[PDB]
Amino acid sequence: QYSSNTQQGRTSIVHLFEWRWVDIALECERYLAPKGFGGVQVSPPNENVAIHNPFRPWWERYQPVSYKLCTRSGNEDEFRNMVTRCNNVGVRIYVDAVINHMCGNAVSAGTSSTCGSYFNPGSRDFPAVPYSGWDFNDGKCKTGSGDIENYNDATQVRDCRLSGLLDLALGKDYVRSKIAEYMNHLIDIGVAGFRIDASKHMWPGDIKAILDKLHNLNSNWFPEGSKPFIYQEVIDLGGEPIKSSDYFGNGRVTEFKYGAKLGTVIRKWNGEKMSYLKNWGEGWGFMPSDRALVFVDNHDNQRGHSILTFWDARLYKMAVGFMLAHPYGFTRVMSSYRWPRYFENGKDVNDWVGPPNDNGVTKEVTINPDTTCGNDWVCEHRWRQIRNMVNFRNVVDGQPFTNWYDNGSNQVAFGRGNRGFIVFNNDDWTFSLTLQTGLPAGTYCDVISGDKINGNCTGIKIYVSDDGKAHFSISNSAEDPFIAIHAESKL
Ligand SMILES: [Ca+2]
Ligand SMILES: [Cl-]
């Protein structure tokens, strides 16, 4: 469960949040494959509640109605078509598995669902599964409201309703089996692994019993003995009875401390500065590198404060660049859509808005001639600075963090063995200095500013001498105040 199962030489996953299956399939072929992306985290592919007030919020996909592969992203045929096409070009698919719960207990009964299946939350009836009252934790939960009231009580956090979401009885073999049936459907289609949604709200042991029932990965694409990559969503900033380490037996765990702290540092808030990043990783109190699933932002937290997002493009690129260059963790890059972020004083009242759509029909991703995307899809994963750092990470895979430099403030640099070097200026003055890069002598294309094409560079050239040293000059007024070079950007 700890192996990503990506094709040899690919180290990142991208979240194509709310993208349709046909667009992901195309993206695998035209972009993700040639640009070295390891795989795609897809939005939940199972049937969910169609919520019409507010109008089709992104969060309706976190309220299951059944396990039919039938959503606004597409139907089963489209999902299967995507998985096959992506696997055929060496790009994996990872499914956001929503298995802790079905929908909100107050949602009206009917067929307001993405595949039209009937369901009745009040009577606990989901006949498309099927599940009935006996399959929820109503009787097991001990809180007066039936919902989670206190995170200091690990028991209720697991057995009670998260914000009223009907809580599945994962202690029961029937329920475990129905979830495994769904995940096995996905595995056989060709899925390489799962983001396990709301893992904190499930007993580590119940997750295990579910994973125990899964098939090995599809033997047309994966070697014998291959198991689904597992990364569990657990927000653990400390101070709670439930810890990320409680889930290590099942697979990787999201390290939410990662983006939170990085955001703080790059914004230079709370006294933080980039020079402090010299011991980034376990030195900052993070979980073991071999268990961490890292990211600067995710689909939930890019909607709140502090976290760096595409809205903060300049600092965001820097944060993502640092993440992709640093050996800690397994990296996930975000890809978003733009929504009319309207604030009512520290409150984005439009943080619920779903993907770009025509009367609820998700819009296709259009590609502009300059490689950006239209229809309000942000496509951060296509931004040159990020796309090139995704490749940097592949190029330097396995090389140790070395050659750290800092000016005691916010000008820092470091290398990855003899294969890559990166330099950042987040201070309010110019960074002009000769640094030891650890790289072989030569002329290297800076892949932040440009690209190596046909024996020359479109952007900045860095000259590494025989002793491995090179001069770097980065103005604080630079749009992208960082430079990155690697073995494959050498002329
Ligand atoms: Ca639960
Ligand atoms: Cl996540």
One of 47, 125, 233, 297 is an active-site residue; which one? 233
Resolution in A: 1.9
Strand partners, 457: 452
Cα 445 to Cα 397: distance, rounded to the nearest angstrom: 19
Cα 9 to Cα 327: distance, rounded to the nearest angstrom: 14
Residues 457 and 362 sit within 8 Å (Cβ to Cβ):
no
229: closest CA among 429, 40, 399? 40
**Helix spans in 194-288 (H):** 204-211, 256-267
Residue for token pair 């009875």? 241
Q: In 3-state terms, the chain is what percent helix, strand and coil (to 5)?
A: 30, 25, 50
Cα 323 to Cα 424: distance, rounded to the nearest angstrom: 12
Distances (CA, A) of 17 to 13, 173, 302, 456, 475: 12, 32, 12, 36, 34
For residue 442, how many C-alpha atoms fall within 13 Å in the half-sphere facing its CB?
19
Does residue 255 have an active-site annotation? no
Contacting residues for 50 by C-beta, under 8 A, at least 6 apart: 56, 60, 112, 113, 114, 360
Cα-to-centroid distance, 381 and ligand 2 (Å): 17
Strand partners, 484: 422
DSSP-derived secondary structure for 403-453: EEEE-SSSEEEEEETTTEEEEEE-SSS-EEEEEE--PPSEEEE-TTT--EE
Cα-to-centroid distance, 148 and ligand 1 (Å): 10
b/e for 251-279, b at 16 or more Cβ within 10 A? bbbbbbbbbbbbbbbbbbeeebbbbbbee
Distances (CA, A) of 158 to 136, 176, 307: 12, 15, 27
Does residue 197 have an active-site annotation? yes
One of 60, 197, 246, 380 is an active-site residue; which one? 197
Residues 470 and 464 sit within 8 Å (Cβ to Cβ):
yes
Cα-to-centroid distance, 412 and ligand 1 (Å): 44
DSSP-derived secondary structure for 66-91: -S-S-BTTB-HHHHHHHHHHHHHTT-
Is 195 marked within a binding site? yes
Cα 282 to Cα 399: distance, rounded to the nearest angstrom: 17
DSSP-derived secondary structure for 289-332: TTTEEE-S--TTGGGSSSS--GGGHHHHHHHHHHHHHS-SSEEE
Rg, C-alpha atoms of the chain: 23
Q: Is 188 helix (H, G, I), strand (E, B) or coil?
A: helix
Sheet holding 482-486, edge to edge: 401-406, 411-416, 420-425, 482-486
| All domains in the chain, ordered by first residue | 2-398 (3.20.20.80), 399-491 (2.60.40.1180)
Is 332 marked within a binding site? yes
